[PDB]
């Protein structure tokens, strides 16, 4: 009855969404062709049923380069998606923010908005949009910045959750990542309700250490991402003792208009071999999700303070045991809250145990936790990126590509001083003040 | 930084409850009658101020705590300077706040050794510091 | 005669109410399908107070269940025991209040209050002689607190000469279910102390304590907590539903336990509470029932009575008992525990006795005491609100939907004033 | 009427109490399930003194079993005749006292006596007219000694005008069960002398000698030892539990046997004790009963009365007999055996007669002597403690948990003063 | 409800622990795969019980060289242990205390402590630690010292029992044994509640004479030590007429802070052929356990005076018989006590007869005795070890290795003086004094 649509831009969004939509069809028992064969509409919020038994997803796959999307048209999920929704261009943005925001993106933005408007009108109880985009890309960073300016105008006040891919501190696929990341953050800082952050390097440590896989390809990495996403909207599709909505994370995790950068975390992540030798009780999976070696962004929360938290259990979870486990977590002192936040926990319990994808690495479990911490420790992640941008912009390296594609050298300075204000605001609010 | 100490099995240095209470009462000038009354954490916070000037904001600590929930907040300020000072002793504040003889003597027994190691002989009154 | 209209708001109200109409149906012998299947004729003597006669001896409850988010109705309409509610009363919105005051009191609650006042008004006209309203909600949510308060203000204007009770679930000190708890609680208390006759404050942390030690349970779900609150909610009403030696009702309790118009926050209780295995080793008698009431362990709100003085106390016994033993021990309790009762209120104990014991018990009773230890609950909330409001944390989503800083100032000063009047009568002589 | 509250401490207290309740249930005709199965109504005439009535005519013992280590509680619950105790009375900790008086009096004692005092207060207020307390323990262990001392002190503080008996298993002179016996023995005896009323000292080596020689048993075990002790205790209580020609009570015994406030260390004994084979070759009569009673070899405390003088003697008979025979034999024994009787206490024999013989016996008798042979036991314990404390062994594990050498010096001084006064009153003219 | 955990350090510790855990699994009726077909809980004190019927031990196998741990992994007890609990390094300490304590052992201590903390937080009624390690071994000595320091720092006052392997006077396998033993004794003299001592040569003699085996490999010694440990823990694990605890042993056996070095003895040790021709009475098994040739440390207590004794009987044992036998033993000439210990026996009785490992050398018995004696005869062993250390250190041998691996001669000098002070204190306490 209540609807939410998802938009995937760039290669990272399409590849992640390809693994995410495989999970939804498994949870609701949807065959790849669209037909159908705690437990008990459910699929209505994500799948729009047609006249026949076919259910088509509410997804809009958009990219400029047609290489990745053509795999979806050919792959096993060929008859599921709506043929028109897969929007493709001719040439990529080529890791250039200007190309995907001023020159090439402008020729396709009108086609995308037409399909978005057609999906919204077909539905009645639209909640908000979920956007899966990267940060170092050209059409995943310069185009999703154009979508925010357009979506926020057609629809005034709606939830807009983003699932970004933070550039790693040491691991780096591109060389112009500091240029695209700084420009994107300055523009989508006023058109994003909350932006969950994920780093690619941090997932490698989780898969190698906890799950014990020595060959974590991008398909094994994208399986961990989809589990968090399904946990965010688990209460919309299932009935639980204490439900939450997309607006609940919105109010509970954003104390200030600019401070809306939480970092996700999942638990438990264990292999099948170690599943038989572990009790996996509520009292310790809460502890597992709080250790600094399990966070999914390469930043240690010990150096900062927790502005707010949000836990989302699911399965055979007793509401009494959650209170006891959380009460002693405030006792343990890997946790340090802020002075002006006497209450700093939000709990949501669901009655649907997490499902497993056959052929995957995760084992079947009866309990799960998806913590969404909003900590001050992410300020060190902005400082590191702001240092790379300042070093490379000093000698105007790589600038001639941006200037000649429809941007001005003055615009580069405006985004630089904006991140200086964000860094100052983040530290000043977090640090204590007299009276 | 501060030098850490341990306490597992030592003789000729275990003080009685009467002497330990006298040392606490004389050092900070209160009228404590039971060692189980140290679960509030108010006296413990002032010990850190004496050992190291500053490093503890004596305003956010409340001394008139009488329920179970401000005891937890009191300890969140007492040894939050432990991380600042580098001492790595972790205490069961979840179990300390119950006001039993079980641990309230064990921790004060360790604190006596810790206080004696880092005390250089400085003297200051607690009356104006408390008020 | 003297019918009671039941209103359930939020998620807790819809979950407590769903477990409340199970107790009432069992008490009156009403089948889940909605038709009387009972044996004793005393059950049907006063059935119109809660239920409502319809065609072919079908009884439908006189309750309306309304919540902004539609996820809760499908849990009770499509679940068991959902075939007896009238489908018209199932009122719901589109999106939840998002744990917000303004989204539950100004923006999204204003579009639904006009569709719920036309069902209360219609239910009131079919009544013979209205007695009062009942509201079950939470003080920490968005729609249970935001729009449940809006219903109180609207109803009070239409029926000023009526008595309504709120079975609120006040937040807990140890854990917080919502990060922005104080903003919703403070803005609601400032509205409750205006236009409610009496309020029964209930806690979740104290329900875990009672169920863990006294009931000796290991995994208390929310089904067992609501099953414990529902017993108290049925104890108050049972005096006007069944004949008794010394009858009482809603109006009688309000007169005896509200000395001043701003002091109507009660702390409920219950007895006996025993485990399944340790029930054959106890003699069920009034002696040990009154002993179980007055110990601080068996209190439904996380407030130790030893920190304050009982202003007034009322106990509603049930079952069949001698009338001498009842008065003999409230004198002994008052004489022995003479230091925890106020001095300028003599004989501050109200007694009522019914004659129908509950299902599967020889005798039981309910304790409702207006104490002064409640002041420690309002002192804690007003402390948390001050810390957050000074830094303006989370406030720029309460201003963006109608409210302003000026509204917050009144809610804090009013709550601080009520604390001062609550303590002034404790040390007064 | 005249209810008695039973408290059991440590492994020894728990086992002795289990045997004692076995004997009491057999005497009163109470089925192990907890319901009356007996025939005569004289058992039901006075059953509230020990047992407690409960719904469905059940009977629950008025016992409070408590010990730090949970092994004894698990054994008593899982074994037979554990289905009648009230589970609330089952109180235990997690870690044992480890044969440490400091650990049993200052570390686990706090919470354990808080819970135990709560239960004791509830039981006492449930009782109609309290008569006294009973505590069975050992002076050699840690938990039993220290925590029984703490319980005795708290009960003395709460109920000053009440009687309590302590059945203490004193350490043996020949072989010591624990290496550090004297410290615990001295501290416990000091506290008991301070704040108890009467104490029946019982040894283990004397019981073993009695079982091997008189009973003619090849493998005497703790079951038989506890059987003998429980038989003595039941014989003590039967005087007020049952009607008789010349009744006696606990207060009567205390008044008659305690001449001075510091002299309440009695030596018990039982008659008749015969082997299974040689029981049909003896004529059961008061002459031979008294003859078996009044010989040192039939003494349950390892002290030879020939080394001292009987300050006072009490004799509780059972069964049916003749007062003429009883008093005539008492006079004959006193006249023939005058040498070891105190001269300045004329008429130093108290006699009571009941009317119900024990199970499977025509008649029996229990003898309780307040003599001056305990001086040797106190002297031996004091000498051992003096040596150990002079060399300062095992003491840093009493100093490391609160105590100090001042307490040890005070306890030793008190023990020496007590033994000196005992000797000086033995040798008085 | 009462939990104690075991840490095995070094090859000797790992092998002894393997034998001990085989014995425990046999005793509690646990299959090698973790399933199962006075006794019920019992196994709760050692085996943590998971979601299924599988029980996993509370053991932390830690080593630096992976050979023995890989052997354990490949062995028949593969499905029992938790795979994460087995911790290995890359290279061994190589009989170097400096290498095992300062350089290498500092790189795995954090992981070991994290696993220990997780295991301790899993349980609720933690009692103490049982540490199985040797003395000659470099990794054993160094890591035992490090673990002692870390555990004493983390957990304040808990029982920490150790089952050492004292170097034999003649039988030996290393050359730096005096150095390693002196250093480890000086380091962990203040972090041990009670340290039971076991020697290889005495067990060799016992197995040669009493049991009549002429090929006594290490398996028989491991079985004997495991039997002793199980006899010690039987009081906790099972019910009995007179129970004792770890704190009971600790209190009754340590009279002075430094004198906490008791020696163990077991009875009866007879083969299968000699079992049918013996009565096995309580008095004669007490005499056998009190005989000098049955002691498991190469030192005859006739040269010393007993300070404390602890008898532990298991089986069909009558307290009257125990009392009579102990009185006779006290009367006997060869048993001499100290003047300030008028009471010198602590007696425990258990109702569970000892079990027999199939294929084992020992035969089934219905009565067993474990005798722990704190005496003065260990002073001669301390003096011999001190003399060996002084003779080797007089001309600075292997000190170049020790100094090069992050140590200075000051540590050697302080260890020497501390050992001399300990020997002086032991002799002074043991000897009589007037008044
Ligand atoms: N976690 C995750 N990240 C991915 C995956 N595939 C690509 N990425 C991220 O995407 C980045 C590559 O840039 P993209 O955002 O994909 O750019 P694009 O979509 O190819 O568009 P152009 O920049 O115009 O070429 C890499 O740095 C990766 O971090 C994936 O499968 N999983
Ligand atoms: N006693 C009891 N309390 C409950 C139960 N379920 C929820 N609660 C309490 O009710 C609060 C839920 O907030 P609500 O007022 O119901 O909010 P909502 O109905 O979900 O609507 P929103 O505020 O917009 O999210 C929680 O903080 C719980 O403490 C229950 O089953 N029993
Ligand atoms: N008569 C008799 N005495 C017993 C029996 N069992 C134990 N004892 C005595 O009681 C003492 C036992 O010490 P306890 O006080 O029970 O100590 P615990 O319960 O084991 O716990 P700790 O004090 O910490 O050691 C022993 O010294 C025995 O002499 C018994 O069955 N009969
Ligand atoms: N009783 C007994 N002792 C053993 C056994 N295995 C090894 N040892 C002892 O262990 C000593 C060898 O030193 P370890 O502690 O094992 O040293 P490691 O584990 O090989 O590691 P490194 O010290 O680095 O060489 C030998 O002197 C033996 O006395 C065994 O199975 N039983
Ligand atoms: Mg691309
Ligand atoms: Mg809601
Ligand atoms: Mg014990
Ligand atoms: Mg090795």
Author numbering:
A (entry chain C), E (entry chain A): 1 to 37, 40 to 42, 47 to 441
B (entry chain T): 1 to 131
C (entry chain D), D (entry chain B): 1 to 429
How is this structure described in the published paper?
Moreover, we could demonstrate that polymerizing ‘mosaic microtubules’ consisting of a mixture of two mutants, αE254Q, and αE254N-tubulin at an optimized ratio, can eliminate mutation-specific biochemical effects, thus generating a faithful mimic of the GTP cap. First, using TIRF microscopy, we performed titration experiments of 20%Q + N-microtubules to measure how much mGFP-EB3 bound to 20%Q + N-microtubules. mGFP-EB3 revealed high affinity with a dissociation constant of 14.0 ± 2.6 nM, similar to that observed for pure αE254Q-microtubules. This affinity is also close to the affinity of EB3 binding to the wild-type GTP cap (39.6 ± 5.8 nM), in agreement with these mosaic microtubules being a faithful GTP-cap mimic. To this end, we imaged undecorated microtubules and microtubules decorated with an N-terminal fragment of EB3 consisting of its GTP-cap recognizing calponin homology (CH) domain. EB proteins were observed to induce compaction and a negative supertwist in all previous EB-decorated microtubule structures solved to date. We report here two EB3-CH-decorated structures with a negative twist, but an expanded lattice conformation. This expansion means that the presence of a glutamine at residue position α254 at the catalytic site can inhibit compaction, possibly arresting the microtubule lattice on its pathway toward the GDP-microtubule lattice state. Remarkably, the EB3-CH-decorated αE254Q and 20%Q + N-microtubule reconstructions preserve an expanded lattice (82.87 ± 0.00 and 82.89 ± 0.00, respectively) while displaying an induced negative twist (−0.23 ± 0.00° and −0.28 ± 0.03°, respectively). Considering that any previous structure of a microtubule decorated with EB3-CH showed both a compact and left-handed twisted lattice, we can conclude that the presence of αE254Q can block the lattice compaction of a GTP-microtubule lattice, even when only a fraction of tubulins carry this mutation as in mosaic 20%Q + N-microtubules. In WT microtubules, a negative protofilament twist may be transiently required to facilitate compaction of the GTP lattice to allow for efficient GTP hydrolysis.
Microtubules are tubular filaments composed of αβ-tubulin heterodimers, which adopt a pseudo-helical geometry. Microtubules switch stochastically between periods of growth and shrinkage, a property called dynamic instability, which is critical for their function. Microtubules are stabilized at their growing ends by the so-called “GTP cap”, a region enriched in GTP-tubulin as a result of delayed nucleotide hydrolysis after GTP-tubulin addition to microtubule ends. The structure of the microtubule lattice in the GTP-cap region differs from the one of the GDP-microtubule, allowing members of the end binding (EB) protein family to selectively recognize the GTP cap, binding there with about ten times higher affinity than to the GDP-tubulin-containing microtubule shaft.
